[PDB]
């Protein structure tokens, strides 16, 4: 339809949501999974030595 | 399970130890038994020769 300065404003609206995510959402959520995965892996290590 | 198996591994070692000792004990007993039967027989045969 019509180009509008809205195209510029949406660039402002966009970037911030990237940074707030990058800092305050993604790493904290990756840790939540990976720590549980580590616990299950060391569980397997214990299972190994348990019979060894 | 790994804690329980560590607790199990001491018992098998301990029983191998004690039974090794009872076995060597009985074998030493038998040596001290046969070496005595040997004396009891040897002296009788000595006396039999001198009586010959």
Sign of CA dihedral B46, B47, B48, B52: positive
What experiment produced this structure? cryo-EM
**C-alpha span between B27 and B4 (Å, rounded):** 35
How far is the C-alpha of A30 from the C-alpha of A41, rounded, in Å?
Answer: 16
Is the CB of residue A46 less than 8 Å from the CB of residue B2? yes
Q: Which residue, A39, A43, A36, A41, is CA-closest to B2?
A: A43
Closest chain B residue to A46, measured at CA: B2
Structure-block tokens of residue B40:
């009891």
Resolution (Å) of this entry: 3.1
Task: Report the C-alpha gap between B16 and B23 in whole angstroms.
Answer: 10
- DSSP helix, strand, coil percent of chain A (3-state; round to 5): 85, 0, 15
- The 8-class DSSP code of residue A4 comes to -
Which residues does chain B have within 8 Å of residue A46's beta carbon, measured at their own beta carbons? 1-2
Residues A31 and A24: their CA atoms lie apart, in Å, by 12
Q: Which residues of B touch A51 (CB under 8 A)?
A: 5
């Amino acid at each position: 339809m019509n180009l509008n300065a809205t195209i510029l404003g949406q660039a402002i609206a966009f970037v911030l949501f990237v940074l707030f995510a990058m800092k305050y959402v993604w790493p904290p959520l990756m840790a939540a999974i990976e720590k549980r995965q580590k616990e299950i892996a060391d569980g397997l290590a214990s299972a190994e030595r348990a019979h060894k | 399970d790994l804690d329980l198996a560590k607790a199990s591994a001491t018992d098998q070692l301990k029983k191998a130890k004690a039974e090794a000792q009872v076995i060597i004990e009985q074998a030493n007993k038998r040596r001290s038994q046969i070496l005595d039967e040997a004396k009891a027989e040897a002296e009788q045969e000595r006396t039999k020769i001198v009586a010959q």
